[PDB]
């Protein structure tokens, strides 16, 4: 009994953490694209603030 569940324990463990590695890198590209759209507004706000 204890070695039958030892089969099934590693097949629910592995598919959870192999999609966490999908989504831990998925957030790494959104927060570097959201900060790409935001920064290009910041360095054109400096010229909208300087000449006044």
């Amino acid at each position: 009994i204890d070695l039958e569940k030892s089969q099934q324990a590693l097949v629910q463990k592995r598919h959870y953490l192999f999609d966490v590695q999908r989504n831990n890198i998925a957030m790494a590209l959104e927060v570097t694209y959201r900060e790409r759209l935001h920064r290009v507004y910041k360095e054109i706000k400096n010229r909208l603030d300087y000449h006044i």
Binding site: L3, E4, S6, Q7, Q8, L10, V11, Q12, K13, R14, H15, Y16, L17, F18, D19, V20, Q21, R22, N23, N24, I25, A26, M27, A28, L29, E30, V31, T32, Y33, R34, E35, R36, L37, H38, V40, Y41, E43, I44, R47, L48, H51, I52
Partner: protein, 147 residues
């Protein structure tokens, strides 16, 4: 913008069980909590660029509008996804290796299950046999049992 969901990071995803490598699994959950707050720091949409008030307030013209004409039709190329596939590639090889316990020990379960069938057979009658009881309790060659 675009934003996809994920699964539960509750029990399995922090118990990856390396060779006493609970520190590497602890670092795996630490990146998800950091990036979700950095995604909560900035929204999906940035601020809007008012164009009409730029012409009157910065009315020294030419040098003000030429930067506003070049920076308006620009594009922001995000970083590459070259490391996105190779990290997902090793998950495909390990998932084929993780079922080896489900492949090899399945016969070890049924051989242990068939061993429980023959173990019922051996005990039999109290006064049964002097050789059928000579499977579990052992015998050996000359001069084994010291005491």
């Amino acid at each position: 913008r675009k934003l996809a969901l994920k699964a539960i990071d509750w029990v399995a995803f922090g118990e990856i069980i390396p060779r006493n490598q609970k520190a590497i699994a602890n670092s795996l959950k630490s990146w998800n909590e950091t990036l979700s707050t950095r995604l909560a720091a900035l929204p999906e949409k940035p601020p809007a660029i008012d164009w009409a008030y730029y012409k009157a307030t910065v009315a020294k013209a030419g040098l003000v509008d030429d930067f506003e004409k070049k920076f308006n039709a620009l594009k922001v190329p995000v970083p590459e996804d070259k490391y996105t596939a190779l990290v997902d590639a090793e998950e495909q090889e390990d998932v084929k290796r993780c079922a080896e316990f489900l492949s090899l020990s399945k016969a070890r379960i049924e051989a242990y299950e068939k061993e429980l069938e023959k173990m019922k057979n051996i005990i039999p009658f109290d006064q049964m046999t002097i050789e059928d009881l000579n499977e579990v309790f052992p015998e050996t060659k000359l001069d084994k049992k010291k005491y």
